[PDB]
Design a protein around this ligand. Structure first.
Ligand code: ZN
Length: 234
């Protein structure tokens, strides 16, 4: 059932990352694709869905392709009226089955619209407890209008806050060596994501965001979230 917590040696270390940390910051700093009540209009590969979603802010795209874990998930949502929320990227983002208004890519981030909102039309607050060197230092709430929300949406909102409040990610590096965000569902199931880039000198945005392809959702009203960081080394 539950994924065991991170073993000490498996967590990505920022001291072992030689690329530009600002490329990780870019994915969570007031950065996200949003849409309500849309239906896919095309596909590229068997596991992805393309939607007509325009960029309200910077006007950088009008088409969004989201890749999912497998063909089953893609077929499930293909003709569904859904809402979308996720982190997009442009580097190594391609369409055209031959030759197939900007375009952008993402992973998962989709939920059915019908029956997924609160009866009184209010927003649900989700508590995020932050731990620094095993000590709970601060806690803050993020908001969502979805009863069943993708873990991706909550993670993004959490990191956006931490970037501003705790300088989670900066241009060169991070004041933290290690970091992971853990979700705890009211059924006892737990899972986590490594918040640091893979070792090396070149951050691969597409490959990192791929972890959201399972389109994992949680109950916003009951889920618990813990962010565990370490400055550990120094
Ligand atoms: Zn909706």
């Amino acid at each position: 059932e539950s994924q065991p917590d991170p073993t000490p040696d498996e967590l990505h270390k920022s001291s072992e990352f030689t690329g530009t940390m600002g490329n990780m910051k870019y994915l969570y700093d007031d950065h996200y694709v949003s849409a309500t009540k849309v239906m896919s209009v095309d596909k590229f590969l068997a596991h992805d869905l393309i939607y007509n979603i325009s960029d309200k802010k910077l006007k950088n795209y009008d088409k969004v392709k989201t890749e999912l874990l497998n063909e089953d998930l893609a077929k499930k949502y293909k003709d569904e009226v859904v809402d979308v929320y996720g982190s997009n990227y442009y580097v190594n983002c391609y369409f055209s089955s031959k030759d197939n208004g900007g375009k952008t890519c993402m992973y998962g981030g989709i939920t059915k619209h019908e029956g997924n909102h609160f009866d009184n039309g209010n927003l649900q607050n989700v508590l995020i407890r932050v731990y620094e060197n095993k000590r709970n230092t601060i806690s803050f709430e993020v908001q969502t209008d979805k009863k069943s929300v993708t873990a991706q949406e909550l993670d993004i909102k959490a990191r956006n806050f931490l970037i501003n409040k705790k300088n989670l990610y900066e241009f060169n590096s991070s004041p933290y060596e290690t970091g992971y965000i853990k979700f705890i569902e009211n059924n006892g199931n737990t899972f986590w994501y490594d918040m640091m880039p893979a070792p090396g000198d070149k951050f691969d945005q597409s490959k990192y965001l791929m972890m959201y392809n399972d389109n994992k959702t949680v109950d916003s009203k009951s889920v618990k979230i813990e962010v565990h960081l370490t400055t550990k080394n120094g």
